[PDB]
Amino acid sequence: FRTFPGIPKWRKTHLTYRIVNYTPDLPKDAVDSAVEKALKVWEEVTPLTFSRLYEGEADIMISFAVREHGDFYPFDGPGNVLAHAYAPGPGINGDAHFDDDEQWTKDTTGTNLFLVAAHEIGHSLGLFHSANTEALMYPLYHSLTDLTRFRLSQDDINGIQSLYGPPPDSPET
Numbered sequence: 356f357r358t359f360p361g362i363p364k365w366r367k368t369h370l371t372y373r374i375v376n377y378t379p380d381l382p383k384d385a386v387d388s389a390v391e392k393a394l395k396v397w398e399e400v401t402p403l404t405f406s407r408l409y410e411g412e413a414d415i416m417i418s419f420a421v422r423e424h425g426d427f428y429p430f431d432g433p434g435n436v437l438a439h440a441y442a443p444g445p446g447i448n449g450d451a452h453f454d455d456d457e458q459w460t461k462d463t464t465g466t467n468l469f470l471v472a473a474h475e476i477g478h479s480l481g482l483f484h485s486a487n488t489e490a491l492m493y494p495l496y497h498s499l500t501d502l503t504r505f506r507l508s509q510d511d512i513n514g515i516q517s518l519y520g521p522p523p524d525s526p527e528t
């Protein structure tokens with residue numbers, strides 16, 4: 356149970372995301388922060404590039420929501436299901452979303468803003484689940500969204516690094 360050895364999530368070299376998440380516990384820049392710490396968490400672990408927007412749909416639509424998606428990935432603030440994103444497909448080709456029934460903070464005041472941010476941005480354009488005992492995919496049950504360590508480990512860095520990585524030679528198509 357971990358990254359898919361032989362199936363890279365995104366292949367392009369320029370991904371983009373949409374900051375559709377937000378909360379009183381995090382103003383635009385704060386929720387956008389987790390979208391920036393998450394996005395950057397994997398944008399830095401890999402050489403891939405990333406852009407942003409707020410219309411149509413980027414590569415990782417980061418949006419806030421709860422038990423009310425329609426008939427699938429049902430959230431539940433009042434439940435371990437803190438957040439999640441989608442996989443490579445049609446529009447769900449990268450889309451994260453933060454629970455909207457509890458709260459998200461960069462520090463340890465609400466939940467784990469960028470923690471679950473790189474968790475979902477890491478989910479679609481990052482990896483599956485690396486040794487997050489230190490990484491970002493398993494800190495949630497603790498504190499590390501901004502306090503004084505807030506960052507990914509070498510195992511999630513490994514999974515995402517397995518996502519993108521250094522170029523072999525062909526600099527362009």
Ligand SMILES: COc1ccc(S(=O)(=O)N(Cc2cccnc2)[C@@H](C(=O)NO)C(C)C)cc1
Pocket residue numbers: 435436437438439440467470471474475478491492493494495496
């Ligand atoms: C920062 O690392 C983590 C982020 C989010 C979660 S989660 O939201 O609790 N959850 C994992 C999980 C919940 C309940 C039982 N077992 C695992 C999300 C998740 O990890 N999404 O990528 C589930 C609901 C998809 C935990 C750690």
Ligand SMILES: [Ca+2]
Pocket residue numbers: 430431432433434435436437454456457
């Ligand atoms: Ca929940």
Ligand SMILES: [Ca+2]
Pocket residue numbers: 412413414415416445446447448449450
């Ligand atoms: Ca997408």
Ligand SMILES: [Zn+2]
Pocket residue numbers: 420424428429430439452
């Ligand atoms: Zn959702």
Ligand SMILES: [Zn+2]
Pocket residue numbers: 474478483484492
């Ligand atoms: Zn996960």
